[PDB]
Amino acid sequence: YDSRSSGVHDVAPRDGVDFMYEGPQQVLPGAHPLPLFHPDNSVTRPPVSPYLPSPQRPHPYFTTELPELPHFQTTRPIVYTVGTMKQRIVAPVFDLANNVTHTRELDPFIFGFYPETEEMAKNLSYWLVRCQNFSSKWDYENREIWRKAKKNWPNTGMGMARVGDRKNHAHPWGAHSKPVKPWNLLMPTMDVKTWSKSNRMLVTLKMLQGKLQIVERLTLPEPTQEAYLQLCRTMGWDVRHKGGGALFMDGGSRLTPSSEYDRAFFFGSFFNGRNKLVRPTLLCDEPYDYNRTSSKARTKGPKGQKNPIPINRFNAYDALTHDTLIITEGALLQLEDEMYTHKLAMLPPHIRAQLPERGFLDSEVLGDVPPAL
Amino acid sequence: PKAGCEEITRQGRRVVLKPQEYFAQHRMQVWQMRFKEMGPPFSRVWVALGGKMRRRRIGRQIDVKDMRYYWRPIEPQYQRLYMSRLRIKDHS
């Protein structure tokens, strides 16, 4: 270290950009008293939020109902579990034509779950492992080499190396003894108990960071890609590779929610840029490993769960590489629906027994309420 | 071309997933009959029976022909030896 004490610099300013430092009043490009490795202001990756995220504001969104816009209460009644933010949220949803129509109140359990880094790491460390090309990690093994299995010269009296059957890992034509094969690489088992938490503490993070945007409908006039860049141009999204992209959780309109993406948008969402149409959900089924001990001795596979989260669910990696998140209400209806029975099962009992009084367990199977959407 | 440039073009045997063992192998039966492990959590004696209780009785001491009848613990120097084969289930 500290070597090369000379010759590393030219004693000359490049006659273009280079520039002296004028004074303390000089506002230097990039400078800031916090150690930020992604120094982005509000003009490069501008947040799509009513207010800029400030320490004062508990969240950069309408904490209250603003009077000049239709307010749409949540699809489901709301309860505030352990980690939730205990602060009401109101996110204005955007018309396709970039206008702001009615504002919609979010669920404080999905979008109100305050972050804590070490419990999205269990999500990220899962993705940075599940997203290897395991089958590429093959490597030749000692036995798999096809060389003579017989010492051609038995070492008896001269100064030859104490070596024979030279198909081991020392020699430039050998292979390892304990090599790396795919069936020896662990794909980690990821519970729904923590995938849900590890998704909710991000889609809140993307709300506290103020990068959360709700759209009425992610539909195009025509399925051509050009119509999807034209849409992005009006909505202002930056699907360029370098400008931070967009993460569409396409769930359909407010009244026609659907999991299978709008066929119009799906074909139009194939732009070479930075964008990733993910599935409108945060849960995924229980993991299982049918080849638990050794049952199937021919599987190629990794070790661990034989039911990995697919590549297009909402993960931690593509949640932090893509600045803005774009959710249609048709997804919010699905997220509140799929996590309702989960949100309720986690309340303490002296609370859980108060629900049917307050109108949370209206069960359309018994007919006490007309069926919800 | 790189690993051996001729050992990897002509093909030998390819290895596959290696089958595991009976993953309750190390509770072998010369303890499932000799000893029994008693105790609350974090103290498990592997109590065993007396050493001399079947071979030679006539003429041995009167009050030592019965020290063979109590469930004595085995001294911990062996507790840790036998219970070592059981810890290995998921080390680290």
Binding site: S294, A297 | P19
Partner: peptide, 5 residues
């Protein structure tokens, strides 16, 4: 299974 022998 075929247990490792």
């Amino acid at each position: 299974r075929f247990y490792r022998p």
